[PDB]
């Protein structure tokens, strides 16, 4: 369909954990990144790899795992230990398979949200539910980086959003079959589920330490677009001649928030402002099927103009309960950014620095664009 699952939403259902034996030399390096980065053998280990053909990867789930393996290796190679000794050329034995596979999955050749959260997980017990206690990630960068907590919590917020995503068919059908009562029950279920996704978001404090995120994990998630340590981008040796720039990972790459924006007719990606340009660009980092779902929603008739035209106050209050749950999420998110970036940065990403300023201004603009779509203030 649009690769949307009814249980896990945009998450890859039950990711694959093992690659064919043909790829053992890839898998060994990814499984041992904390150790290999710590000693400083990681970059040697990459430079001595053979060139493995991607032809022995024979389905989507196996391609997704291979992207996740190669994306983590690539971040470990470029940033190394995390202190400024960078590499600007990615050796051909990684770059050629990584670029070929990325072109086939229609994704930029850099680690994205959909690799390290949406496919980087397993159930411990396949019988018991999708809870933190029954889950684990497949790969980590450094001992102590809190990557399990950070990836698993993001995932659980995605799985929470799933119960709301499966109501979107009901909304477009109720509109055209002119079914007022079922449209209203649907809009309230969406809002109920966005409110539950916010409470799951609170669990990030239970599992992620600000100091570990800011001084360790954040560095391996960063990219090479507008990054002065790699001001021209990365050379993907043997595939493109010139360096190329790609952005680092963020849940701006999550289809979740963008999809309820389109649904509720809130015009973020609309305009030429720098906030609209960012959010549109982050769509190039989403899997193609999810990109297409988003664009499909953009073309269907407007839920906002429907509600606005029917003089029906219960409909307007149900629409508003959806707009409100997005403002809440985005406001809790500002708090999150303050606690995990602005405050640790003060111990150039500080609140009044050049980075911490443009990012808070972007986030506050998106939240305030959302808040304006309220029908009742
Ligand atoms: C330690 C935790 C987190 C931090 C520091 C953080 C930080 C940021 C920052 C700085 C941005 C600005 C855009 C960019 O530079 O890419 C951003 C964007 C965004 N983040 Fe986060 N984030 C965290 C976790 C999450 C989680 C768990 C979610 C949702 C599950 C999320 C959802 C979003 C969304 C949707 C955007 C795009 C802006 C918007 O649509 O309102 N973030 N995040
Ligand atoms: N680390 S700090 O910058 O110095 N703290 C400044 C205030 S935040 C804070 N204080 O206690 N817990 C905090 C927290 N908030 O989300 N998460 C957390 C912290 C430590 C851990 F080992 C784990 Br697991 C999770
Ligand atoms: N260089 S920077 O100033 O710190 N800007 C960094 C841009 S935001 C950021 N950084 O890490 N995570 C970020 C994020 N933001 O929503 N969500 C997130 C959550 C789970 C993931 F698997 C990934 Br991938 C991303």
Curated annotation (Swiss-Prot):
Enzyme Commission code: 1.13.11.52
Cell location: Cytoplasm, Cytosol
Residues noted as binding heme b in the record, renumbered to the chain: 333
Coiled-coil stretches: none
Pfam families on file: IDO (PF01231)
Major location (coarse): cytoplasm
Pathway named in the protein's UniProt entry: Amino-acid degradation; L-tryptophan degradation via kynurenine pathway; L-kynurenine from L-tryptophan: step 1/2
Annotated keywords: Cytoplasm, Dioxygenase, Heme, Immunity, Iron, Metal-binding, Oxidoreductase, Tryptophan catabolism
Domain of life of the native organism: Eukaryota
Organs and tissues of expression: Expressed in mature dendritic cells located in lymphoid organs (including lymph nodes, spleen, tonsils, Peyers's patches, the gut lamina propria, and the thymic medulla), in some epithelial cells of the female genital tract, as well as in endothelial cells of term placenta and in lung parenchyma. Weakly or not expressed in most normal tissues, but mostly inducible in most tissues. Expressed in more than 50% of tumors, either by tumoral, stromal, or endothelial cells (expression in tumor is associated with a worse clinical outcome). Not overexpressed in tumor-draining lymph nodes.
Cofactor requirement: heme b
Any one GO CC term of the record: cytosol
Matches recorded under InterPro entries: Indolamine_dOase (IPR000898), Trp/Indoleamine_2_3_dOase-like (IPR037217)
Molecular functions per Gene Ontology: electron transfer activity; heme binding; indoleamine 2,3-dioxygenase activity; metal ion binding; tryptophan 2,3-dioxygenase activity
Modulation of this protein's activity: Activity is inhibited by and MTH-trp (methylthiohydantoin-DL-tryptophan), modestly inhibited by L-1MT (1-methyl-L-tryptophan) but not D-1MT (1-methyl-D-tryptophan).
Textual note on the cofactor: Binds 1 heme group per subunit. In the active form, the heme iron is in its ferrous state Fe(+2). The catalytic cycle does not alter the oxidation state of the heme, but IDO1 is prone to autoxidation.
Catalysis performed (reactions): D-tryptophan + O2 = N-formyl-D-kynurenine; L-tryptophan + O2 = N-formyl-L-kynurenine
Subunit structure: Monomer.
Entry-linked PANTHER family: INDOLEAMINE 2,3-DIOXYGENASE, INDOLEAMINE 2,3-DIOXYGENASE 1
Note: IDO1 is the target for therapy in a range of clinical settings, including cancer, chronic infections, autoimmune and allergic syndromes, and transplantation. IDO1 and IDO2 are 2 distinct enzymes which catalyze the same reaction. IDO2 affinity for tryptophan is much lower than that of IDO1. 50% of Caucasians harbor polymorphisms which abolish IDO2 enzymatic activity. IDO2 is expressed in human tumors in an inactive form: tryptophan degradation is entirely provided by IDO1 in these cells. IDO2 may play a role as a negative regulator of IDO1 by competing for heme-binding with IDO1. Low efficiency IDO2 enzymes have been conserved throughout vertebrate evolution, whereas higher efficiency IDO1 enzymes are dispensable in many lower vertebrate lineages.
Family in the record: Belongs to the indoleamine 2,3-dioxygenase family.
Protein name, per record: Indoleamine 2,3-dioxygenase 1
């Amino acid at each position: 369909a649009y690769h949307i699952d009814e249980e896990v939403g945009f998450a890859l259902p039950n990711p694959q954990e093992n690659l064919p034996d043909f790829y053992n030399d890839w898998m060994f390096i990814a499984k041992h990144l904390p150790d290999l980065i710590e000693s400083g053998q990681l970059r040697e280990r990459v430079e001595k790899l053979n060139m493995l053909s991607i032809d022995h990867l024979t389905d989507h789930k196996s391609q997704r795992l291979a992207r996740l393996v190669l994306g983590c290796i690539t971040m470990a190679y470029v940033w190394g230990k995390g202190h400024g000794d960078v590499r600007k050329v990615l050796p051909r034995n990684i770059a050629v398979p990584y670029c070929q596979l990325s072109a086939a999955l229609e994704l930029p050749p850099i680690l994205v949200y959909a690799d390290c959260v949406l496919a980087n997980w397993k159930k411990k017990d396949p019988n018991k539910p999708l809870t933190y206690e029954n889950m684990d990630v497949l790969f980590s960068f450094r001992d102590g980086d809190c990557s399990k907590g950070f990836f698993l919590v993001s995932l659980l917020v995605e799985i929470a959003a799933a119960s709301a995503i499966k109501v979107i068919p009901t909304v477009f059908k109720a509109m055209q079959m002119q079914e007022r009562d079922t449209l209203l029950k649907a809009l309230l279920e969406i809002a109920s589920c966005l409110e539950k996704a916010l409470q799951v978001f609170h669990q990030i404090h239970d599992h992620v330490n600000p100091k570990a995120f800011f001084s360790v994990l954040r560095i391996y998630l960063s990219g090479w677009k507008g990054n002065p340590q790699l001001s021209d981008g990365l050379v993907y040796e043997g595939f493109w001649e010139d360096p190329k720039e790609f952005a680092g990972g963020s849940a701006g790459q999550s289809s979740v928030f963008q999809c309820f924006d389109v649904l509720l007719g809130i015009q973020q990606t609309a305009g030429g402002g720098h906030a609209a340009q960012f959010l549109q660009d982050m769509r190039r980092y989403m899997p193609p099927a999810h990109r297409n779902f988003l664009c499909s929603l953009e073309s269907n008739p407007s839920v906002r103009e429907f509600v606005l035209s029917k003089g029906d106050a219960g409909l307007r209050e149900a629409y508003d309960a959806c707009v409100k749950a997005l403002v809440s999420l985005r406001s809790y998110h500002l708090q999150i950014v303050t606690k995990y970036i602005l405050i640790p940065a003060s111990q150039k990403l500080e609140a009044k620095g050049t980075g911490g300023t443009d990012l808070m201004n972007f986030l506050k603009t998106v939240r305030s664009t959302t808040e304006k779509s309220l029908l009742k203030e």
